[PDB]
């Protein structure tokens, strides 16, 4: 989803489900490629 | 009128977007690596291009 | 009025400065739950006396 060649529109957004895996969020929050990272109901570092 | 004992005026430069990390209790590339403030911070911040 | 009743679900989920806002709601609620209990038993202790 992050490195996807194509995204959808807001008219119909792509809800890609994830399950049965290890979610290593370290390469997403610590990566210097996102101009915004806003964790509302959770801490961004506690996710790992 | 109100006054205090001491003050520690800091001095540095950052990008315009990175000023949002200059606040009590932030997180990012500055507050976790370069320059961090306390959650109970008291003072005034000023900047100019 | 908090996100959850369990503290570890707030400590292990949120940052300190955002948790204190939620933690304070549980304290103010649980403290009233005690004063209501102690104030009633003082009245029950007068009937028994």
UniProtKB/Swiss-Prot annotation, chain B:
Outcome of substituting residue 29 to T: In strain: Gamma/P.1
Q: Cite the residue spans of the region called Integrin-binding motif.
A: 15-17
Query: What domain of life does the native source organism fall in?
Result: Viruses
Query: What quaternary structure, including any partners, is listed in this protein's UniProt entry?
Result: Binds to host ACE2. RBD also interacts with the N-linked glycan on 'Asn-90' of ACE2. Cleavage of S generates a polybasic C-terminal sequence on S1 that binds to host Neuropilin-1 (NRP1) and Neuropilin-2 (NRP2) receptors. Interacts with host integrin alpha-5/beta-1 (ITGA5:ITGB1) and with ACE2 in complex with integrin alpha-5/beta-1 (ITGA5:ITGB1). May interact via cytoplasmic c-terminus with M protein. May interact (via N-terminus) with host bilirubin and biliverdin, thereby preventing antibody binding to the SARS-CoV-2 spike NTD via an allosteric mechanism.
Q: What is the stated purpose of this protein?
A: Attaches the virion to the cell membrane by interacting with host receptor, initiating the infection. The major receptor is host ACE2. When S2/S2' has been cleaved, binding to the receptor triggers direct fusion at the cell membrane. When S2/S2' has not been cleaved, binding to the receptor results in internalization of the virus by endocytosis using host TFRC and GRM2 and leading to fusion of the virion membrane with the host endosomal membrane. Alternatively, may use NRP1/NRP2 and integrin as entry receptors.
The protein's name: Spike protein S1
Q: What organism is listed for this UniProt entry? A: Severe acute respiratory syndrome coronavirus 2
From Swiss-Prot, chain C:
Q: Return the protein name.
A: Spike protein S2'
**Function per UniProt:** Subunit of the fusion protein that is processed upon entry into the host cell. Mediates fusion of the virion and cellular membranes by functioning as a class I viral fusion protein. Contains a viral fusion peptide that is unmasked after S2 cleavage. This cleavage can occur at the cell membrane by host TMPRSS2 or during endocytosis by host CSTL. In either case, this triggers an extensive and irreversible conformational change that leads to fusion of the viral envelope with the cellular cytoplasmic membrane, releasing viral genomic RNA into the host cell cytoplasm.
Q: Give me the gene this protein comes from.
A: S
Q: Which domain of life is it from?
A: Viruses
Swapping residue 12 to A leads to an effect described as: In strain: Alpha/B.1.1.7
Q: Which organism is it from?
A: Severe acute respiratory syndrome coronavirus 2 (2019-nCoV)
């Amino acid at each position: 989803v992050f490195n996807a060649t194509r995204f959808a529109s807001v008219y119909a957004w792509n809800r890609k489900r994830i399950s049965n895996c290890v979610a290593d969020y370290s390469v997403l929050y610590n990566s210097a490629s996102f101009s915004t990272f806003k964790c509302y109901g959770v801490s961004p570092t506690k996710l790992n | 009128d109100l006054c205090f004992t001491n003050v520690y005026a800091d001095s540095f430069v950052i990008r315009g977007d990175e000023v949002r990390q200059i606040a009590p209790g932030q997180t990012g590339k500055i507050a976790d690596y370069n320059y961090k403030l306390p959650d109970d911070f008291t003072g005034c911040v000023i900047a100019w291009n | 009025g908090a996100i959850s009743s369990v503290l570890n679900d707030i400590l292990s989920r949120l940052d300190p400065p955002e948790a204190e806002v939620q933690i304070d709601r549980l304290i103010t609620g649980r403290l009233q739950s005690l004063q209501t209990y102690v104030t009633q038993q003082l009245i029950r202790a007068a009937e028994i006396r």
